[PDB]
Coordinates of N, CA and C in Angstrom, one line a residue:
Chain A
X1 N 8.5 -31.0 9.5 CA 8.4 -32.3 10.1 C 9.4 -33.3 9.6
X2 N 9.6 -34.4 10.3 CA 10.6 -35.4 9.9 C 10.2 -36.7 10.5
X3 N 11.0 -37.8 10.2 CA 10.7 -39.1 10.7 C 11.6 -39.4 11.9
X4 N 11.1 -40.3 12.7 CA 11.6 -40.6 14.0 C 11.6 -42.2 14.2
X5 N 12.3 -42.9 13.3 CA 12.3 -44.3 13.4 C 12.6 -44.8 14.8
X6 N 11.7 -45.6 15.4 CA 11.8 -45.8 16.8 C 12.7 -47.0 17.1
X7 N 12.3 -48.2 16.6 CA 12.9 -49.4 17.0 C 12.6 -50.5 16.0
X8 N 13.6 -51.1 15.4 CA 13.4 -52.2 14.5 C 12.8 -53.4 15.2
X9 N 11.8 -54.1 14.6 CA 11.2 -55.2 15.2 C 12.1 -56.4 15.1
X10 N 11.6 -57.5 15.9 CA 12.3 -58.8 15.9 C 11.6 -59.6 14.8
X11 N 12.3 -59.9 13.7 CA 11.7 -60.5 12.5 C 11.9 -62.0 12.5
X12 N 13.2 -62.4 12.5 CA 13.4 -63.9 12.4 C 13.4 -64.5 13.8
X13 N 13.3 -65.9 13.8 CA 13.2 -66.6 15.0 C 14.0 -67.9 15.1
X14 N 14.7 -68.3 14.0 CA 15.4 -69.6 14.0 C 14.5 -70.8 14.3
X15 N 13.6 -71.0 13.3 CA 12.6 -72.1 13.4 C 13.3 -73.4 13.2
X16 N 12.6 -74.5 13.4 CA 13.0 -75.8 13.1 C 12.9 -76.1 11.6
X17 N 13.7 -77.0 11.0 CA 13.7 -77.2 9.6 C 12.8 -78.3 9.2
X18 N 11.5 -78.2 9.6 CA 10.4 -79.1 9.1 C 9.2 -78.3 8.7
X19 N 8.9 -77.2 9.3 CA 7.6 -76.5 9.1 C 7.7 -75.7 7.7
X20 N 6.6 -75.7 7.0 CA 6.5 -75.0 5.7 C 5.9 -73.6 6.0
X21 N 6.5 -72.9 6.9 CA 6.0 -71.5 7.2 C 6.9 -70.9 8.2
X22 N 6.9 -69.6 8.3 CA 7.6 -68.8 9.3 C 6.6 -68.4 10.4
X23 N 7.1 -67.5 11.3 CA 6.3 -67.1 12.4 C 6.3 -65.6 12.5
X24 N 5.2 -64.9 12.8 CA 5.1 -63.5 12.8 C 6.0 -62.9 13.8
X25 N 6.4 -61.6 13.6 CA 7.3 -60.9 14.5 C 6.8 -59.5 14.8
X26 N 7.4 -58.9 15.8 CA 7.0 -57.6 16.3 C 7.3 -56.5 15.2
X27 N 6.4 -55.5 15.1 CA 6.6 -54.4 14.1 C 7.5 -53.3 14.6
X28 N 7.8 -52.3 13.7 CA 8.5 -51.1 14.1 C 7.7 -49.9 13.9
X29 N 8.1 -48.8 14.7 CA 7.4 -47.6 14.7 C 8.2 -46.5 14.1
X30 N 7.6 -45.5 13.5 CA 8.2 -44.5 12.7 C 8.1 -43.1 13.2
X31 N 6.9 -42.8 13.9 CA 6.7 -41.6 14.7 C 7.0 -40.3 14.0
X32 N 6.1 -40.1 13.0 CA 6.3 -38.9 12.2 C 5.9 -37.7 13.0
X33 N 6.9 -37.0 13.6 CA 6.7 -35.9 14.5 C 7.2 -34.6 13.8
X34 N 6.9 -33.5 14.4 CA 7.2 -32.2 13.7 C 7.9 -31.3 14.7
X35 N 8.2 -30.1 14.3 CA 8.8 -29.1 15.1 C 8.7 -27.7 14.5
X36 N 8.6 -26.6 15.2 CA 8.4 -25.3 14.7 C 9.7 -24.5 14.8
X37 N 9.6 -23.3 14.3 CA 10.8 -22.3 14.3 C 10.3 -21.0 14.7
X38 N 11.1 -20.3 15.5 CA 10.7 -19.0 16.1 C 11.4 -17.8 15.3
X39 N 11.0 -16.6 15.6 CA 11.4 -15.4 14.9 C 12.0 -14.4 15.9
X40 N 12.9 -13.6 15.4 CA 13.6 -12.6 16.2 C 13.6 -11.3 15.4
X41 N 13.2 -10.2 16.1 CA 13.0 -8.9 15.5 C 13.1 -7.8 16.5
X42 N 13.4 -6.6 16.0 CA 13.4 -5.4 16.8 C 13.6 -4.2 15.9
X43 N 13.6 -3.0 16.6 CA 13.6 -1.8 15.8 C 14.5 -0.8 16.6
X44 N 14.9 0.3 15.9 CA 15.7 1.4 16.4 C 15.5 2.6 15.5
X45 N 15.4 3.7 16.1 CA 15.1 5.0 15.4 C 16.4 5.9 15.4
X46 N 16.2 7.0 14.6 CA 17.3 8.0 14.5 C 16.6 9.3 14.1
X47 N 17.3 10.4 14.3 CA 17.0 11.7 13.7 C 17.6 11.7 12.3
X48 N 17.6 12.8 11.6 CA 18.3 12.9 10.3 C 19.4 13.9 10.4
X49 N 19.2 15.1 11.0 CA 20.4 16.0 11.2 C 21.3 15.4 12.2
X50 N 20.8 14.9 13.3 CA 21.7 14.3 14.3 C 22.5 13.1 13.9
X51 N 22.2 12.6 12.7 CA 23.0 11.5 12.1 C 23.9 12.0 11.0
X52 N 23.6 13.1 10.3 CA 24.5 13.6 9.3 C 25.7 14.2 9.9
Chain B
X1 N -15.5 32.0 -18.1 CA -15.2 31.9 -16.7 C -13.6 31.9 -16.6
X2 N -13.1 32.1 -15.4 CA -11.7 32.2 -15.2 C -11.4 32.0 -13.7
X3 N -10.1 31.9 -13.4 CA -9.6 31.7 -12.0 C -9.3 33.0 -11.3
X4 N -9.4 33.0 -10.0 CA -9.3 34.3 -9.2 C -8.6 34.0 -7.9
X5 N -7.5 33.2 -7.9 CA -6.8 32.7 -6.7 C -6.7 33.8 -5.7
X6 N -7.1 33.6 -4.5 CA -7.3 34.7 -3.5 C -6.0 35.0 -2.8
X7 N -5.4 34.1 -2.1 CA -4.3 34.4 -1.2 C -3.6 33.1 -0.9
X8 N -2.3 33.1 -1.1 CA -1.5 31.9 -0.8 C -1.5 31.7 0.8
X9 N -1.6 30.5 1.2 CA -1.6 30.2 2.6 C -0.2 30.4 3.2
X10 N -0.2 30.3 4.6 CA 1.0 30.4 5.3 C 1.4 28.9 5.7
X11 N 2.4 28.4 5.0 CA 2.7 27.0 5.0 C 3.8 26.6 6.1
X12 N 5.0 27.2 6.0 CA 6.1 26.9 6.9 C 6.0 27.7 8.2
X13 N 6.6 27.2 9.2 CA 6.5 27.7 10.6 C 7.8 27.9 11.3
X14 N 9.0 27.6 10.8 CA 10.2 27.6 11.5 C 10.1 26.9 12.8
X15 N 9.9 25.6 12.7 CA 9.7 24.7 13.9 C 11.1 24.4 14.5
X16 N 11.1 23.9 15.7 CA 12.3 23.4 16.4 C 12.9 22.2 15.7
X17 N 14.2 22.0 15.8 CA 14.8 20.9 15.1 C 15.0 19.7 16.0
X18 N 13.9 19.3 16.6 CA 13.8 18.0 17.3 C 12.6 17.2 16.9
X19 N 11.5 17.8 16.6 CA 10.3 17.1 16.4 C 10.4 16.4 15.0
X20 N 9.8 15.2 14.9 CA 9.8 14.4 13.6 C 8.4 14.7 12.9
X21 N 8.1 15.9 12.7 CA 6.8 16.3 12.1 C 6.8 17.8 11.8
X22 N 6.0 18.2 10.9 CA 5.7 19.6 10.6 C 4.5 20.0 11.4
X23 N 3.9 21.2 11.0 CA 2.7 21.7 11.6 C 1.8 22.3 10.5
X24 N 0.5 22.0 10.5 CA -0.3 22.3 9.4 C -0.4 23.9 9.2
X25 N -0.8 24.3 8.0 CA -0.9 25.7 7.7 C -2.2 26.0 7.1
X26 N -2.4 27.3 6.9 CA -3.7 27.8 6.4 C -3.8 27.5 4.9
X27 N -5.0 27.3 4.3 CA -5.1 27.0 2.9 C -5.3 28.2 2.0
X28 N -5.4 28.1 0.7 CA -5.6 29.1 -0.2 C -6.9 29.0 -1.0
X29 N -7.4 30.1 -1.5 CA -8.7 30.0 -2.2 C -8.5 30.5 -3.7
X30 N -9.4 30.0 -4.5 CA -9.2 30.1 -6.0 C -10.3 30.8 -6.7
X31 N -11.5 30.7 -6.1 CA -12.6 31.6 -6.5 C -12.9 31.5 -8.0
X32 N -13.3 30.3 -8.5 CA -13.6 30.1 -9.9 C -14.9 30.9 -10.2
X33 N -14.8 32.1 -10.7 CA -15.9 32.9 -11.0 C -16.0 33.2 -12.5
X34 N -17.1 33.8 -13.0 CA -17.4 33.9 -14.4 C -17.7 35.3 -14.7
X35 N -18.0 35.6 -16.0 CA -18.4 36.9 -16.5 C -19.0 36.7 -17.9
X36 N -20.1 37.5 -18.2 CA -20.8 37.4 -19.4 C -20.3 38.5 -20.4
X37 N -20.9 38.4 -21.6 CA -20.6 39.5 -22.6 C -21.9 39.9 -23.2
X38 N -22.0 41.2 -23.5 CA -23.2 41.8 -24.0 C -23.2 41.9 -25.6
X39 N -24.3 42.4 -26.1 CA -24.4 42.5 -27.6 C -24.8 43.9 -27.9
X40 N -24.5 44.3 -29.2 CA -24.8 45.6 -29.7 C -25.4 45.5 -31.1
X41 N -26.5 46.1 -31.4 CA -27.1 46.0 -32.7 C -28.1 47.1 -32.9
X42 N -28.4 47.3 -34.2 CA -29.4 48.3 -34.7 C -29.6 48.1 -36.1
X43 N -30.5 48.9 -36.7 CA -31.0 48.8 -38.1 C -31.1 50.2 -38.7
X44 N -31.2 50.2 -40.0 CA -31.4 51.4 -40.7 C -31.9 51.0 -42.1
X45 N -32.9 51.8 -42.7 CA -33.5 51.4 -43.9 C -33.2 52.4 -45.0
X46 N -33.6 52.1 -46.2 CA -33.4 53.0 -47.4 C -34.5 52.7 -48.4
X47 N -34.7 53.6 -49.3 CA -35.4 53.3 -50.5 C -34.5 52.7 -51.5
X48 N -34.9 52.5 -52.8 CA -34.0 52.0 -53.8 C -33.7 53.1 -54.9
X49 N -34.7 53.7 -55.4 CA -34.5 54.8 -56.3 C -33.8 56.0 -55.6
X50 N -34.4 56.4 -54.4 CA -33.8 57.5 -53.7 C -32.4 57.3 -53.3
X51 N -31.8 56.1 -53.5 CA -30.4 55.8 -53.2 C -29.6 55.7 -54.5
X52 N -30.2 55.3 -55.6 CA -29.5 55.3 -56.9 C -29.2 56.7 -57.3

């Protein structure tokens, strides 16, 4: 698994220079998603004399 | 007791040189049998003066 940072939120807003506080902004998502892995295999035979 | 192995089995068969296997053979017998032993004894007497 791994992280999938989606979109940075809008944090600042350019307020007026009188208020003694900021204003809330939109958050960001991280979307911790995963993924699997597959396998590959096979076989093959032989004789012993027919190979010597 | 002692061993009495009867007869060695027939193991090999001169098979064809294509099959990836042998063929089973007859077994052998061992006949763990026993035997006892007998005893032999007797007595004979004498006088004492008549022997001096």
